[PDB]
Symmetry: C7
């Protein structure tokens, strides 16, 4: 039982809102639909935020894992 590895723990967020910070300072929010071991992700109803402003609505999007800094839980 003693603690899931990080990529297994990530599965606990499937179908939940998440916050993704990317290299280069970009930030996105959306519902996590799937991921793989490279940390590539597919999000639904995604938006890109900038200085607290939604600067773009990305709909369903695939984010390439090597651009990611961190993934955290979003409002909800």
């Amino acid at each position: 039982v003693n603690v899931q590895r990080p990529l297994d723990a990530l599965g606990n967020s499937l179908n939940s809102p998440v916050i993704i910070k990317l290299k280069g300072d970009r930030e996105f929010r959306g519902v996590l639909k799937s991921f793989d071991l490279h940390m590539n992700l597919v999000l639904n109803d995604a938006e890109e935020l900038e200085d607290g402003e939604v600067t773009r609505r990305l709909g369903t999007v695939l984010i390439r894992g090597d651009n990611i800094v961190y993934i955290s839980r979003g409002k909800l």
Copy 2:
């Protein structure tokens, strides 16, 4: 269900997409094919800047390591 990201990408073949690259370039076009490295081939592609078409390229091969995200966007 829910396919892994690279399998789910198959559902976008023949759909219009928006590709954002590292370093800010953006491309819009119809996804024709892809592979495991995320290398992509788009038809009727154009490069954009600030919501502006700066170049019309037709069919282009995009190297996968340059990709930040692939979006299906909004109507």
Copy 3:
């Protein structure tokens, strides 16, 4: 003496400081990690030069962004 990734096991459930490429810093409790150095922290906070820029809660950090990991001190 344990190899680096095995010694890190010593910090599970302990407060840590994660310094990233770009000067961003995270402080939180280490819950798990994997061989790529991907990490899960609980009660995490993000910092931009001593200033707590955000309270994340549980967060997954991609290992390729890490510069170092050191011992921190727990919150209240």
Copy 4:
């Protein structure tokens, strides 16, 4: 089910292409061959800067990791 990207690139062999590299740099030439890393060999290659030719290089081997995209040239 169409060709994977690197298999489709084979249809441009002996044709004019535009190679965009990271850093606004760009090459034009006839595609002679390539490999799985996307390293390429171009004939009658010319390097460009802001639409203007900077150097005529002749045959050139370009390392794949420098590539942003490949498109066809109107040559």
Copy 5:
């Protein structure tokens, strides 16, 4: 002659200097390392421009940030 990573073993338990990409630098006692060059330092301190910016205690440094590793000096006395 030993290969680089094998010769590094001779520096275990000795003070070293770790120069990183971007110029920071760490000084401390080398406790262990692995084949990716990740390493563990005891009594570590971070420096920038030669001035110590913080004392970290025991630290795990990810290897791909390393430029070089050399030996450190002991206190002037």
Copy 6:
């Protein structure tokens, strides 16, 4: 019939080449050998800047990941 890039490079052994690196450094010398990572050994190597020889290095080993492209020097 169509030599892959790294096999074709072998045809430049012992001839003058020009190597452009990331960050715009440029070297010229006689290609002596190379490997699959594109690491190279050059004889009579010279570093160039702006267009002028800024350094004479003799025999040099260049690490492949720094390379942008390799082309033929002058006879």
Copy 7:
């Protein structure tokens, strides 16, 4: 009969060399060993920051992925 690059590098063992790094740092010293990643150990190492000595290091282990080129010194 030419040796592959990493094999040709063996010829410089126990000889003075110049190591130029990504960014721009430069080191001079005697090459003692290396591995397939191009990590190197130099003896009597000295760093040069634009034409001249800025730091004497003694023995140093340079990580291979930082290297741009290696040439014969002196």
